Nucleic acid binder design. Structure first.
Ligand SMILES: [K+]
Ligand SMILES: [Mg+2]
Ligand SMILES: [Mg+2]
Ligand SMILES: [Mg+2]
Ligand SMILES: [Mg+2]
Ligand SMILES: [Mg+2]
Ligand SMILES: [Mg+2]
Ligand SMILES: [Mg+2]
Ligand SMILES: [Mg+2]
Ligand SMILES: [Mg+2]
Ligand SMILES: [Mg+2]
Ligand SMILES: [Mg+2]
Ligand SMILES: [Mg+2]
Ligand SMILES: [Mg+2]
Ligand SMILES: [Mg+2]
Ligand SMILES: [Mg+2]
Ligand SMILES: [Mg+2]
Ligand SMILES: [Mg+2]
Ligand SMILES: [Mg+2]
Ligand SMILES: [Mg+2]
Ligand SMILES: [Mg+2]
Ligand SMILES: [Mg+2]
Ligand SMILES: [Mg+2]
Ligand SMILES: [Mg+2]
Ligand SMILES: [Mg+2]
Lengths: 122, 72, 99, 86, 137, 97, 49
RNA sequence: AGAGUUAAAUUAUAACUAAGCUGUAAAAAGCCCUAGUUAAAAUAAAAUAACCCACGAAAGUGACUCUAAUAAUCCUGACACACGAUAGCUAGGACCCAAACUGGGAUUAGAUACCCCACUAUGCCUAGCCCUAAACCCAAAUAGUUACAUAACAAAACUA
């Protein structure tokens, strides 16, 4: 995967939630993106009230979409999701699996530094 | 000025055998469509030296470095 | 005549290895009301307190068991050209020597 | 403003005393440094003063935490001297 | 006797009822302790004000109203007016840092009012309006 | 001819360096529980190195991972999420005395 | 090796043909990334609840 | 350098209660179109992490995301080319809040100052100019040595 879409949806019933995902994925495919899979994080109470499209939301559903897309089409996807009203907060980040966990050896102890002053009689 | 074709495999995934037998899905995922500007520079540099330089395998030569700077 | 290098190889100190967590027996050579000055064969003398059990039999010349942690306590502080030694050693009491 | 109320920076009294509960709250803020932060936000300090304050706070924290280690390191050398009048 | 400092979360169901009502049903006592004045207001669970009192309204005037004693008297007066309307327990919310924080807390205690929870809601900007300049006294 | 002289070899008693709590582990902005354990439950502040105990690599990553979740809408900002209040304690700070 | 795994990963990619099926499957299989860490460095999975 | 985004605080604004509210070592002036609580745009600024010391040539930069991206196969070099905090100027837009100037209060022999209240330029965005700092780590760049050797003080001394 290359890009990850942290998608938060307004809490609603099963039919409209499926419809919202169906058209959101359709918008991604129109911009030239090959979506890998869709991950569902369930519905949870939002950490804080989020104001979007003249509404106050306290509960929402979380969904995650990962895809390969050209670099120039990220703005179009972000702009398209902003106009949509069934999505409360869209964010796009590079997929964390793109970077590899750098190998580590240990906590190297830093010795105290000497020779910071002259040796004259204080 | 140069214009790398869009539907071309990036520098790394070219010499490996058995590419043309793969479906269009993977070829799309390796083409310049799903590659950033950094991969584009590699294709520009690779093509540019093969057209003007005499010995491409030599990197320490002055002519090779001048080509590299021109790309940047 | 035995060369000095051969003496270090077979010396008990070299065979000990690191001084941390080593069971070493020692002998008491000076007694205060609550402090027992114990010599364990190292360069300096470690100091330990008299245990509450069988405290009456800790006398001069008595052999006890120790767990060495640092052979010589020594640390470096900022502004000090040379480390400030404590002229002692760190050890704990595991009991009296089982004759 | 948007978060739930009566969750953050809240303590509950026990057995009907309130002076003890209040002191617990102050230790929470002092450890997290909010009490000093509110003191410094009553007026505005220029960024020139902010860095000069962080160069005195850090230096004190180094000297104090180093002198503290020496005291603990030399603490065992306070028993009665066994060689008095030697 | 396992006692937890953290408040009973509304989402869960904690069997800790004071005077027959739940935790969120108990009224609120807002305390704004500034550096020159202390204002005490008690409001219902529906945020409907019951009684209001401050160092100014209790006869203290000018510099005197900023002292601890003035805040202590305000706590006594506010509790008496609150107890008249029939409230036993209250969740006190402290606003700001000032000399009247301690006195107002125990002022409600000695005024015939019982507190169960203390909250500090001091306005803490996260970077916000630029405050006034320094005072070269 | 003397074989008793020491040889120039590295120290064989070099104890392996201490590993931080999150060493060789992948932090993330999606697991709130991992990020929530390093936040003061009463105020919401982020603990420093002297309290968290993490190394210099996993301290910055935790800080960046936490702040990403603050804005993207995955965890509260001014308090610790009460659902994860009973997780095992890893920090070294004590409030109750 | 890298292109070989993409060859296998291409089978499970979401296409317009199976857009409904994947969405319906996703809505019925919740999953979480939450896992805690102990002092000794061992991973604790809340899925045991 | 662009594009998108907002957590905590504050204000316009509405409801309710209260008669007072701000302010100081102490007061007056100001406000009463006010204060407390609940609900809440825009503008501006970026708690804890930071007891970390990273990036850039310097001045500088530490809220989040994406795009573009950090010269030289790795010496010195100007009056030449490019850049340069903050204040200031020209044109348009924004204005929570801070605030030179100015007005009021107080202090004082006087106070066109320190202290208190109000408000403007301006601090902000877009385009252009100005090219000044204790622009100071008062320590020039590149290779090195710990030899020789303490004016003083400071951040030890020196060679090409
Ligand atoms: K901030
Ligand atoms: Mg807000
Ligand atoms: Mg710009
Ligand atoms: Mg008056
Ligand atoms: Mg008002
Ligand atoms: Mg406006
Ligand atoms: Mg710095
Ligand atoms: Mg340079
Ligand atoms: Mg460079
Ligand atoms: Mg040059
Ligand atoms: Mg300039
Ligand atoms: Mg300027
Ligand atoms: Mg200007
Ligand atoms: Mg002019
Ligand atoms: Mg103008
Ligand atoms: Mg203005
Ligand atoms: Mg103003
Ligand atoms: Mg005047
Ligand atoms: Mg400077
Ligand atoms: Mg100079
Ligand atoms: Mg210079
Ligand atoms: Mg020069
Ligand atoms: Mg250079
Ligand atoms: Mg040099
Ligand atoms: Mg002298």
């Amino acid at each position: 995967p290359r890009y990850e879409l942290a998608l938060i949806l307004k809490a609603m019933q099963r039919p409209e939630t499926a419809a919202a995902l169906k058209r959101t994925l359709e918008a991604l495919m129109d911009r030239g993106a090959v979506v890998r899979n869709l991950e569902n994080l369930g519905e949870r109470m939002l950490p804080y009230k989020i104001s979007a499209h003249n509404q106050r939301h306290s509960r929402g559903g979380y969904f995650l979409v990962d895809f390969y897309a050209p670099a120039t089409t990220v703005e179009s996807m972000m702009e398209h999701l902003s106009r949509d009203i069934d999505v409360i907060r869209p964010n796009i980040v590079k997929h964390p699996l793109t970077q590899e966990v750098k190998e580590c050896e240990g906590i190297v102890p830093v010795p105290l530094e000497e020779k910071l002053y002259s040796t004259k009689k204080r | 000025q140069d214009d790398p074709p869009p539907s071309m495999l990036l520098l790394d995934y070219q010499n490996v055998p058995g590419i043309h037998k793969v479906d269009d899905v993977v070829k799309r995922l390796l083409s310049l469509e799903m590659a950033n500007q950094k991969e584009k520079l590699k294709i520009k540099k690779m093509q540019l030296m093969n057209k003007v330089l005499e010995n491409p395998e030599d990197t320490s030569s002055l002519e090779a470095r001048i080509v590299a700077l021109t790309v940047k | 005549v035995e060369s000095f290098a051969s003496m270090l190889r077979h010396s008990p100190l070299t065979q000990m290895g690191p001084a941390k967590n080593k069971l070493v027996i020692g002998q008491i050579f000076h007694i205060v009301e609550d402090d027992l000055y114990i010599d364990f064969g190292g360069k300096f003398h470690c100091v330990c307190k008299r245990p509450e059990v069988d405290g009456e039999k800790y006398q001069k010349g008595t052999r006890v068991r120790l767990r060495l942690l640092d052979l010589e306590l020594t640390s470096r502080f900022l502004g000090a050209t040379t480390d400030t030694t404590i002229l002692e050693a760190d050890a704990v009491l595991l009991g009296l020597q089982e004759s | 403003a948007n978060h739930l109320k009566f969750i953050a920076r809240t303590v509950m009294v026990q057995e009907g005393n309130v002076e003890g509960a209040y002191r617990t709250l102050n230790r929470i803020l002092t450890m997290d440094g909010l009490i000093e932060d509110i003191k410094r936000r009553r007026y505005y300090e220029k960024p020139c003063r902010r860095r000069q304050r962080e160069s005195y706070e850090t230096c004190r924290r180094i000297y104090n935490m180093e002198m503290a280690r020496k005291i603990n390191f030399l603490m065992r050398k306070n028993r009665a001297d066994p060689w008095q009048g030697c | 006797s396992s006692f937890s400092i953290y408040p009973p979360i509304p989402g869960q169901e904690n069997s800790l009822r004071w005077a027959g009502k739940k935790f969120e049903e108990i009224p609120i006592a807002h305390i704004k302790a500034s550096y020159n004045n202390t204002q005490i207001q008690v409001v219902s669970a529906a945020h409907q004000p019951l009684a209001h009192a401050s160092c100014g309204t209790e006869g203290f005037r000018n510099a005197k109203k900023g002292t601890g004693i003035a805040a202590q008297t305000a706590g006594i007066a506010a509790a008496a007016k609150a107890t008249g309307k029939g409230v036993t327990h209250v969740r006190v919310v402290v606003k700001g840092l000032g000399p009247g924080r301690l006195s107002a807390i125990k002022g409600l205690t000695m005024g015939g009012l019982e507190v169960i929870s203390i909250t500090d809601n001091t306005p803490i900007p996260h970077x916000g309006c630029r405050p006034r300049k320094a005072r070269r006294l | 001819s003397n074989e008793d002289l020491p040889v120039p070899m590295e120290n064989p008693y070099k104890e392996p360096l201490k590993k931080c709590i999150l060493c060789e582990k992948h932090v993330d902005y999606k697991n709130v529980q991992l990020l929530s354990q390093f936040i003061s439950p009463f105020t919401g502040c982020i603990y420093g190195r002297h309290i968290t105990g993490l190394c210099g690599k996993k301290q910055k990553e935790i800080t960046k991972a936490i702040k990403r979740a603050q804005i993207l809408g995955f965890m509260p900002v001014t308090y610790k999420d009460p659902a994860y209040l009973k997780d095992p304690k890893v920090c070294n700070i004590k409030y109750r005395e | 090796q890298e292109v070989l795994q993409l060859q296998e990963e291409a089978k499970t990619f979401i296409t317009r043909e199976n857009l409904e099926a994947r969405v319906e499957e996703a809505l019925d299989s919740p999953k979480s990334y939450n896992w805690a860490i102990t002092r000794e460095g061992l991973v604790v999975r809340p899925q045991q609840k």
